[PDB]
């Protein structure tokens, strides 16, 4: 006699790389960088299509601050003020809903982290090719 | 569905900066005084579904007060702000609270002591007791360092939905497009590269 | 757009359009809502908008429209009432009263339009503040009379009376003159006997209705001020503590009332009143136990569930019990028939203290502090509370929060990480918990030890193992250092450290190890008395910290370095002596192995290590031995320095790659760290590097200027130039640090100062603004502070080099160059304090700029700057007065006395500098008292404007009267005259002078202020 007992959309992706970062977007009108979020930047590879995107969420709120394919045509360039950041143009990011173009800057805790990011970024671009 | 939140407090306490941080992620360093009120929708994803706050960010400067307590009508929750580096802003908390509860008699209210990132703190933790008899929730916050920045909205969401176990959750991450106007001109990039990132001494 | 129509006052107001604009604002969104808002604000702010109010109130079908109509009237009543002709005042009163009566008589409106009614009531109270009782003597009798005619009206009258009491007693201090506040308080007091009669009657004849709640809400406000006889000589306490506690509708407000009763001013020699105070508490506690929850209830769980109003109730219960017991527990402590009541009340507090809610915990903890501090001193009391205190030990021990020293924490992924930010809130909570646990330990040291040891047992065997449990216990163990005997402590600490060390070896993984390591470090750092008595233990502990400096966890490394410092501050003697059965002092071993020990530390951590060595070395007071220790300590940075100085001077420069700049910065930072702990003892090391360091400062400065010239101002943002500026900043910091602690000031003056000024001053002056380091100003402030009196010509040089050029950086707005701003006024303050003669040597045009700069400072909202500006002004006036009757002082007054008076008045009265009120008032009083006391020996007036022989007293009053008349044209001449008469008569009594200034600040916000207000006491 057994007694009757008491009654994200990232699921199909692999994490290739994760790093803590601060993301900025450039305001051309104001001519200034504006913070978009701080948290883990992940490179996620779709298991079916093998395509690699950047997905970044803010600490605590978990809100998306970056969501775009690591396009082969993108290039990481240095910012004049920093040895631990990269700037690049993105033509289709959907963090805020509708596809929108941005000039991003992403900054890391150290030059080493920035350099490892660049390596992983360009690897992801090759996978996407 | 949605809840009206009124944000009140002295001029310069960081009300608009706090809201902007939540809206866009940015930290506005400039003080541009709010004129009357600025209304902003703000959505959080929780384990009980999305919650939308309609944030009425009111003016703290008397000269720019606009409709004053007229903004409070039909508010369902509130945040009262002060600046822990300015004693006068804490002195004025009972005045904001008086004006607010006279219009909104039984709403959940968070009291926030902002700018706790600043070294020379003037309103010490032990001085802050006004919330006790008024049944206000209290948090030390910093819009600059983001210390406790989520807590006021989490507490209000728990009170408004009536679920103490409610938590923020990761919003759905839809697949992003591919976008290969072939000869588009981006000297915009050189401007961006040659404009220094702010706060280069921060940890990040 | 169509919405703008309501702004055209030439046409009759279209009420339907107004209602549309209002609906769009409140219920709409986006651009249309924004447009509507702006239009409503313009409408409201139109000075004739109040003429529409009656029409809007009569014709509108939108409650918000009517609310806005009342706001418009509120603005008129509170600022311009006395300008209106009398029939408009009678008219506004009449229709506000009529609207309220009308709304109350319609049951449907009374139920559904509470916001509008409450707003109408507040508007009536604004009229009462202007008119009552002098032009409305029958208000209270008619209010009482009307209350019997209708329950809605009676209820609404309680709202009106509540709001009146608030405005008169709770919020009058800032909003009314002293005279008007006193007039209204006296007026309410004279009619309260009949207000109370009505209140008590309503309370007697009902149970839990909306009328009863409204009445109790009014009573809550009355309890702030009414005489105790209304509470103790009536049956009101019985009603509050029995009847109104039974019904949940009335329970919340009644509990708040009983909390305020517990604060009434009450005779202390009266056995009857003491019985009544006991009885209401007994009744209230019985009602809680029977109607709400028994003493045994799990309040932690109840609060967590957050049903209905349970959280607010438990908060309010905490406030009631803590308030009453802190005042009255002695009434319950002697009578054996009251013991159960006393202990039950405390048992509810114990249960409340288990609730997971930080702010509520702080409230209960404050009470526990009050209790245990009393039990510590008061004879024969602690035994009463022995069971309460034993439970409290457990509660505190189980809920200890993270001390400042514990630099590891668990993130949201459950990973042990280095703390991102210091938590001032939790730091203060830890200290509060420590204070209470320290008292509790003293009250029963055996109980405390037994609780901690039995908990420790369940961590070793794994039965209660968790990060939370090992952390709280370890923090508690560390927190009670000092409470045990040396022998009991010895056995205790030995056991704890032994078991924690065993736990560290036993548990697996980087996370577990980091947690236990942090706990070991917290505990050892808290028991220096033990370590000092036990060298072999101390030595082993230090070797353990050195092991932690090799861990891959940066938080553990950080804490190891900080703990090293914390131990060394207390135990340094034992590192300097040669200990029995050792071959050398441990400091020599430490220094020899420093490269090995610090190999895996980041630079900042290495500097902390050197700082700790500096603390130890300054324990050696024999100079030859100490200087040799210092030389030994600095061998590595000095060797690195010598080769960089060779490189830099043999190849100047074209050799400052980024790595070299980092090396140089870290050498200087190492020197700063050691100088911080050694202070005056650092001089020989400073001497070793000084001249080459200043040469390096010059070389770095040249490179920075060259980079800016070749690359633009943007160069200052580059890693290269930021790195070079770090070198300059750290050099300035080293010199500042040394001079701030120097004991031989003669050497500072003869050896250090001239080369410093030569190296830094022209460089600062001759760089572009974006390349100037604020740290130069900071360094000079310390130079002037410490040796300014010995270098008058050096102080003049400092002024010449930094004054005009820094002023020009900061005088275009209040925001640019924030650090220069702050350091500039700190420097001017110290020069004005210590070397005033330097200002006397300025040419008149420059001295004018100095006065300009001071006045500029007190217009800042930035507190740092504002406060220094007001202080420099006060100090300057005192400096001038100290000179007596001499040309410079006479000319100062003729040129600047009225500038200082007017500028001080401006910031006092502009409503944008309220934080500086006290210092503004002090400055104004000083200025006025100079004339009052005939301390200005020349006429302040020009020969033409006033009859010769006219006193400065008469001219000052004339000048001020004219100034105020033009600045505040809405004041009558009599207001201005009376204000100035009072202010001048009161210039030797700051508290009263300030009161008169506050009265003036109230009067300038309205029309028709009573000039006799300035005769107040
Ligand atoms: N250091 C620090 N500064 C802050 C913080 N939050 C805001 N500030 C600063 O404080 C200033 C005033 O901010 P703002 O948000 O405009 O204040 P407000 O309360 O909206 N003013 P108003 O009522 O007049 O509209 C800004 O310069 C902003 O950068 C903080 O957490 N820390
Ligand atoms: Cl302050
Ligand atoms: Cl309304
Ligand atoms: Cl010692
Ligand atoms: Cl007059
Ligand atoms: Mg604002």
- C198's CB contacts (< 8 A; 6+ apart) are C144, C147
Q: Which residue among A80, A82, A83 places its CB closest to the CB of C714?
A: A80
Residue of B14, B20, B89 to test ligand 1 pocket, by largest number of atoms within 8 Å of CB: B14
Indicate which of C708, C719, C720 best probes the interface with A, i.e. most A CBs within 10 Å of its own CB: C719
For tokens 């809903």, name the residue.
A97
CB contact C297 to B (< 8 Å) = no
Please name the residue ranges forming H helices in B25-171. 87-91, 93-103, 130-134, 151-161
> Which domain CATH number covers B178?
3.40.50.300
Cβ within 8 Å, pair B203-A109: yes
Q: How far is the CA of C393 from the centre of ligand 3 (A)?
A: 52
Alpha helices in C712-753 (DSSP H): 719-741, 745-747
Q: How far apart are CA C617 and CA C630, in angstroms?
A: 7
SS3 category, C138:
coil
- CA–CA gap between residue C471 and residue A67 (Å, rounded): 39
Tokens describing residue A37: 């979020």
Residue A15, both tokens: 């994490």
In sequence order, what are the residues at sequence separation of 6 or more whose Cβ sits closer than 8 angstroms to the Cβ of residue C67? B70, B73, C115, C116, C119
List phi, psi (to 5°) of B138: -120, 135
Q: Which residue's CA is minimally distant from atom 30 of ligand 1?
A: B115
- B142 has binding-site annotation: yes
- Alpha helix locations (H) across chain B? 15-24, 87-91, 93-103, 130-134, 151-161, 188-193
Helices (H) and strands (E) in chain C, counts: 52, 2
Looking at the DSSP bridge assignments, the partners of residue C418 are: C408
The answer, for A124 touching chain B at a CB cutoff of 8 Å, is no
The dihedrals phi and psi of C112, each to the nearest 5 degrees, come to -95, -15
Count B/C contacts: CB-CB distance under 8 Å: 98
Burial B133-167 (b: 16+ CB within 10 A, else e): eebbbbbbbbbbbbbbbbbbbbbbbbbbeeeeebe
Burial of C182 from C-beta contacts in 10 A (0-12 / 13-18 / 19+): middle
Phi/psi for C947 (5° steps) reads -50, 135
The whole-angstrom separation of Cα C632 and Cα B145 is 41
CA distance C678 to C741: 9
Which numbered ligand comes closest to the C-alpha of C113? 3
Q: Cβ contacts (< 8 Å) between C412 and chain A: which residues?
A: 59-60
H/E element holding C596?
helix C594-597
Residue C183's contacts (CB-CB under 8 Å, 6 or more residues apart) are: none
Q: What is the 3-state secondary structure (H, E, C) of C52-80?
A: HHHHHHHHCCCHHHHHHHHHHHHHHHHHC
Q: Which residues pair with B79 in a beta bridge?
A: B7, B110
By Cβ distance, the residue of B37, B70, B194 closest to C68 is: B70
Rounded to an integer, what distance in angstroms lies between the CA atom of residue C745 and that of residue C854? 31
Residues 6+ apart with CB under 8 A from A104: A23, A24, A25, A26, A36, A66, A87, A88, A89, A90, A93
Q: How far apart are CA C358 and CA B139, in angstroms?
A: 10
Please state, in angstroms and rounded to a whole number, the distance separating the CA atoms of residues C384 and C284: 22
Give whole-number Cα distances, C582 to C515, C539, C612, in Å.
Answer: 33, 11, 21
CA–CA distance, C647 with C311 (Å, rounded to integer): 70
* C967 CA from centroid of ligand 5 (Å): 16
> Partners of A39 in the beta sheet?
A21
Ligand nearest to the backbone CA of C576: 4
Strands ordered across the beta sheet of A64-69: A64-69, A52-57, A32-46, A13-27, A100-107, A85-93
In angstroms, what is the span from residue C447 Cα to ligand 4's centroid? 32
Tokens read off for C738: 């040394």
- Cβ atoms of A88 and A104 closer than 8 Å: yes
Beta-bridge mates of residue A77: A87
How far apart (Å, rounded) are the C-alpha atoms in residues B162 and B51? 12
Sign (positive or negative) of CA dihedral C891, C893, C898, C899: positive
CB-based contact, A22 to chain B, within 8 Å = yes
Q: Which residue range forms the structural domain that includes residue B150?
A: 1-204
Nearest beta carbon to residue A103 from set B27, B188, B197 = B188
Do residues C295 and C347 make contact, with C-beta atoms less than 8 angstroms apart? yes
Closest CA to A56 of A110, A102, A112: A102
Q: Which residue has the tokens 């008491």?
A: A6
Sort C712 into a burial class: Cβ within 10 Å, 0-12 / 13-18 / 19+: exposed
State the Cα–Cα distance between residues C678 and C178, nearest whole angstrom.
56
C906-909, long-range: CB within 8 Å, 24+ apart, which pairs?
C907/C858, C907/C859, C908/C997, C908/C1001, C909/C967, C909/C968, C909/C1000, C909/C1001, C909/C1004
Number of inter-chain CB pairs under 8 A, A vs B: 127
Per CB-CB distance under 8 Å, the chain C contacts of A82 are 719
Whether B26 and A36 lie within 8 Å, measured CB to CB? yes
**Beta-carbon contacts of residue A42 (< 8 Å; ≥ 6 apart):** A15, A17, A18, A54, A55, A56
Beta carbons of B183 and B143 less than 8 angstroms apart? no
Residues C614 and C571: beta-carbon distance below 8 Å: no
Bridge partners, A76 (sequence order): none
Nearest CA to CA, how far is B147 from chain C (Å)?
Answer: 8
Residues 6+ apart with CB under 8 A from C189: none
Residue bearing tokens 């916050």:
B141
CB distance from A70 to chain B under 8 Å? no
Nearest CA to B164 among B47, B64, B45? Answer: B47
In SS3 terms, C916-927 reads as HHHHHHHHHHHH
Alpha helix (H) residue ranges in C651-744: 658-678, 683-711, 719-741
Q: What domains appear along chain A, each with residue ranges and CATH number?
A: 1-129 (2.30.29.30)
On whether the CB atoms of residues C645 and C706 are closer than 8 A, the answer is: no
Residues C242/C301, Cβ–Cβ less than 8 Å: no
CA distances from C335 to C324, C330, C585 (A): 17, 10, 64
CA of B32 to the centre of ligand 1 (A): 9
Of C923, C958, C930, give the one whose Cα is nearest residue C942.
C958
Give SS3 for A68: strand
Ligand 1 pocket residues where CB is under 6 Å:
B 9, 11-17, 28-31, 33-34, 59-61, 114-115, 117-118, 142-144
Query: What is the helix, strand, coil percentage profile of chain A, to 5?
Result: 15, 45, 40
Distance CA(B116)–CA(B84), nearest Å, equals: 6
C348 and C321 Cβ atoms separated by less than 8 Å: yes
CA C155 to chain centre: 41
Sequence-ordered alpha helix ranges (H) in B10-129? 15-24, 87-91, 93-103
Exposed/middle/buried for residue C639 (C-beta within 10 Å: 0-12, 13-18, 19+): exposed
In angstroms, how far is CA C424 from the centroid of its own chain? Answer: 12
Structure-block tokens of residue B99: 């004006």
CA separation for the pair C265, C261 (Å, rounded): 9
Give Cα C765 to chain centroid, integer Å. Answer: 37
Nearest CA in chain C to B200: C717
Given in angstroms, what resolution was this structure solved at? Answer: 1.8
Could you write out the DSSP letters of every residue in C99-127?
HHHHHHHSHHHHHH-HHHHHHHHHHHHHH
Q: From CA A23, how far away is CA A19, in angstroms rounded?
A: 12
Q: How far apart are CA B191 and CA C841, in angstroms?
A: 49
- Residues sharing a CB contact under 8 Å with residue C561, sequence separation 6 or more, in sequence order: C549, C601, C605, C608, C609, C612
Q: Which of B168, B186, B189 sits opposite A62 (nearest CB)?
A: B168
Provide the chain C residues 695-724 that lie in CB contact (below 8 A) with chain A.
Answer: 714, 717-719
Contact A108, A21 (CB under 8 A): yes
Chain breaks in chain A (C to N over 2.5 A) after: 7
| Cα–Cα distance measured from residue B194 to residue B189, given in angstroms and rounded to the nearest whole number | 9
Among the listed residues C468, C466, C522, the one whose alpha carbon sits nearest the alpha carbon of residue C496: C522
CA of C119 to the centre of ligand 3 (A): 8
d(CA B114, CA B123): 10
Contact B170 A57 (CB under 8 A): yes
Instruction: Please report the residues numbered 640 through 679 in chain C whose beta carbons come closer than 8 angstroms to any beta carbon of chain A.
Output: 658
Which residues are within 5 Å of ligand 5 (an ion), measured at CB?
C 972-974
Between strands B2-9 and A32-46, the pairing is unpaired
Residues 71-90 of A with CB under 8 A from C: 80-83
CA atoms of A71 and A126, how far apart (whole Å): 9
Report how this structure was experimentally obtained: X-ray
Name the token pair of C570: 């207390």
Chain A partners within 8 Å of B139 (Cβ): none
Contact C1003, C1013 (CB under 8 A): yes
- The tally of domains found in chain B comes to 1
The minimum-distance atom of ligand 1 relative to the CA of B64 is: 24
């Amino acid at each position: 006699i057994h007694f009757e007992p008491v009654v994200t959309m990232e699921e199909d992706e692999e994490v290739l790389y994760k790093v803590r970062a601060k993301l900025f977007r450039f305001d051309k009108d104001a001519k200034e960088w504006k913070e978009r979020g701080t948290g883990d930047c992940k490179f996620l590879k779709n298991k079916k299509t093998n395509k690699v995107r950047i997905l970044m969420r803010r600490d605590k709120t978990l809100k998306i601050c970056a969501n775009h394919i690591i396009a082969p045509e993108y290039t990481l360039k240095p910012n004049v003020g920093s040895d631990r950041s990269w700037v690049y143009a993105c033509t289709a990011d959907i963090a805020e809903g509708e596809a929108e173009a941005f000039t991003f800057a992403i900054r890391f805790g150290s030059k080493e982290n920035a350099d490892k990011f660049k390596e992983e970024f360009e690897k992801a671009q090759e996978i996407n090719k | 569905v949605q809840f009206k939140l009124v944000l009140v407090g002295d001029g310069g306490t960081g009300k608009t900066t706090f809201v902007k941080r939540h809206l866009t992620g940015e930290f506005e360093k400039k003080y541009v005084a709010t004129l009357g009120v600025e209304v902003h929708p703000l959505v959080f994803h929780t384990n009980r579904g999305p919650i939308k706050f309609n944030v009425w960010d009111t003016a703290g400067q008397e000269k720019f007060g606009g409709l004053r307590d007229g903004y409070y009508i039909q508010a369902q929750c509130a945040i009262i702000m002060f600046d822990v580096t300015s004693r006068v802003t804490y002195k004025n908390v009972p005045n904001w609270h008086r004006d607010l509860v006279r219009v909104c008699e039984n709403i959940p209210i968070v009291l926030c002591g902002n700018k706790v990132d600043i070294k020379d703190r003037k309103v010490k933790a032990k001085s802050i007791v006004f919330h006790r008899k008024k049944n206000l929730q209290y948090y030390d916050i910093s819009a600059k360092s983001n210390y406790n920045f989520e807590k006021p909205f989490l507490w209000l969401a728990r009170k408004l939905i009536g679920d103490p176990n409610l938590e923020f959750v990761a919003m759905p991450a839809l697949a992003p497009p591919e976008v290969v106007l072939a000869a588009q001109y981006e000297h915009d990039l050189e401007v961006a590269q040659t404009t220094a990132l702010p706060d280069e001494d921060d940890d990040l | 757009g169509a919405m703008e129509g309501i702004l055209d006052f030439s046409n009759d107001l279209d009420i339907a359009l107004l209602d549309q604009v209002v609906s769009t604002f409140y219920q709409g969104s986006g651009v249309q809502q924004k447009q509507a808002q702006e239009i409503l604000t313009k409408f409201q702010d139109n000075p004739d908008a109040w003429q529409k109010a009656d029409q809007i109130l009569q014709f509108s079908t939108n409650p918000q429209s009517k609310f806005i109509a009342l706001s418009i009237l509120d603005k008129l009543i509170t600022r311009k009432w006395k300008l209106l002709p009398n029939d408009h005042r009678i008219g506004i009163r009449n229709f506000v009263v009529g609207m309220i009566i009308s709304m109350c008589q319609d049951d449907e409106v009374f139920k559904t339009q509470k916001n509008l009614i409450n707003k109408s009531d507040l508007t009536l109270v604004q009229i009462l503040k202007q008119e009552w009782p002098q032009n409305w003597p029958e208000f209270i009798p008619e209010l009482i009379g009307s209350s019997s005619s209708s329950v809605n009206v009676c209820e609404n009258n309680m709202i009106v009376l509540k709001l009146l009491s608030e405005e008169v007693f709770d919020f009058s201090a800032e909003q009314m003159t002293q005279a008007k506040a006193l007039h209204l308080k006296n007026s309410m007091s004279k009619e309260f006997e009949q207000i109370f009669k009505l209140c008590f009657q309503v309370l007697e004849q009902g149970s839990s209705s909306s009328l009863i709640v409204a009445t109790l809400e009014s009573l809550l406000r009355y309890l702030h001020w009414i005489p105790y006889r209304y509470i103790y000589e009536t049956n009101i306490l019985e009603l509050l503590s029995t009847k109104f506690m039974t019904s949940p509708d009335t329970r919340a407000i009644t509990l708040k009332c009983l909390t305020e009763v517990s604060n009434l001013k009450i005779p202390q020699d009266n056995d009857l009143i003491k019985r009544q105070t006991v009885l209401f508490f007994q009744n209230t506690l019985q009602q809680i136990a029977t109607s709400v929850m028994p003493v045994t209830a799990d309040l932690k769980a109840t609060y967590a569930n957050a049903n209905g109003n349970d959280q607010s109730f438990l908060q309010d219960l905490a406030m009631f019990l803590t308030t009453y017991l802190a005042r009255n527990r002695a009434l319950l402590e002697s009578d054996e028939s009251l013991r159960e009541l006393l202990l039950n009340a405390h048992q509810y507090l114990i249960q409340l203290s288990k609730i997971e809610e930080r702010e509520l915990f702080k409230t209960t903890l404050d009470y526990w502090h009050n209790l245990v501090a009393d039990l510590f001193y008061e004879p024969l009391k602690k035994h009463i509370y022995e069971e309460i205190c034993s439970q409290l030990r457990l509660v505190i021990i189980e809920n200890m929060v993270r001390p400042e020293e514990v630099l590891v924490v668990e993130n949201d992924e459950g990973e042990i990480v280095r703390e991102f930010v210091k938590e001032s809130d939790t730091i203060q909570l830890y200290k509060s918990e420590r204070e209470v646990l320290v008292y509790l330990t003293h009250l029963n040291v055996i109980d405390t030890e037994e609780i901690m040891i039995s908990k420790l047992a369940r961590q070793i065997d794994g039965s209660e193992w968790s990060w939370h449990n090992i952390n709280t216990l370890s923090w508690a163990i560390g927190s009670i250092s000092g409470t045990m005997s040396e022998d009991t402590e010895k056995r205790f600490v030995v056991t704890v450290i032994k078991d924690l060390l065993d736990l560290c070896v036993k548990k697996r993984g980087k996370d577990n190890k980091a947690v236990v390591a942090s706990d070991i470090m917290y505990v050892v750092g808290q028991y220096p008395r033990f370590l000092k008595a036990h060298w072999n233990f101390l030595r082993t502990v230090i070797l353990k910290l050195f092991e932690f400096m090799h861990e891959t966890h940066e938080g553990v490394q950080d804490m190891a370095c900080d703990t090293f410092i914390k131990i060394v501050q207390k135990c340094k003697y034992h590192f300097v002596i040669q200990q029995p059965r050792e071959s050398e002092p441990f400091i020599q071993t430490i220094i020899r192995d420093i490269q090995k020990t610090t190999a895996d530390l980041q630079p900042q951590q290495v500097h902390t290590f050197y700082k700790a060595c500096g603390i130890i070395i300054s324990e050696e007071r024999s100079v030859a031995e100490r200087n040799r220790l210092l030389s030994d300590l600095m061998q590595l940075p000095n060797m690195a320095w010598d080769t960089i100085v060779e490189q830099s001077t043999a190849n100047p420069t074209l050799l400052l790659d980024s790595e070299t700049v980092k090396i140089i910065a870290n050498i200087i930072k190492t020197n700063v760290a050691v100088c911080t702990s050694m202070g005056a003892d650092f001089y020989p090391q400073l001497g070793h590097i000084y001249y080459n360091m200043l040469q390096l400062y010059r070389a770095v400065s040249s490179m920075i200027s060259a980079q800016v010239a070749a690359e633009g101002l943007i160069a200052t943002k580059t890693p290269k130039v930021r790195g070079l500026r770090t070198i300059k900043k750290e050099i300035l910091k080293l010199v500042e640090t040394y001079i701030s602690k120097a004991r031989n000031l003669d050497d500072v003056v003869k050896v250090l100062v001239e080369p410093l000024l030569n190296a830094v001053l022209e460089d600062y002056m001759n760089n572009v603004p974006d390349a100037r380091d604020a740290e130069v100003l900071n360094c000079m402030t310390t130079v002037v502070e410490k040796v300014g009196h010995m270098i008058p010509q050096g102080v003049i040089l400092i002024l010449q080099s930094v004054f005009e050029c820094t002023l020009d950086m900061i005088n275009k707005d209040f925001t640019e160059y924030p650090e220069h701003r702050v350091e500039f006024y700190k420097l001017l303050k110290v020069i004005n304090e210590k070397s005033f003669a330097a200002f006397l040597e300025l040419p008149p045009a420059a001295f004018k700029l100095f006065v300009d700069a001071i006045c500029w400072a007190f217009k800042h909202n930035n507190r740092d700057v504002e406060v220094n500006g007001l202080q420099i002004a006060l100090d300057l006036v005192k400096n001038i007065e100290r000179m007596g009757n001499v040309p410079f002082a006479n000319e100062f007054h003729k040129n600047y006395f009225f500038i200082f008076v007017s500028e001080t008045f401006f910031v006092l009265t502009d409503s944008d500098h309220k934080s500086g009120f006290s210092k503004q008032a002090l400055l104004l009083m000083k200025l006025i008292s100079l004339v009052y006391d005939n301390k200005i020996s020349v006429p302040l007036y020009q020969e033409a404007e006033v009859p010769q022989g006219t006193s400065n007293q008469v001219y000052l009053s004339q000048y001020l009267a004219n100034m105020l008349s033009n600045a505040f044209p809405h004041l009558t001449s009599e207001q201005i005259a009376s204000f100035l008469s009072a202010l001048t008569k009161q210039c030797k009594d700051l508290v009263v002078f300030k009161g008169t200034l506050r009265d003036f600040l109230v009067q300038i916000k309205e029309v028709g202020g009573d000039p006799t207000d300035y005769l107040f006491a």
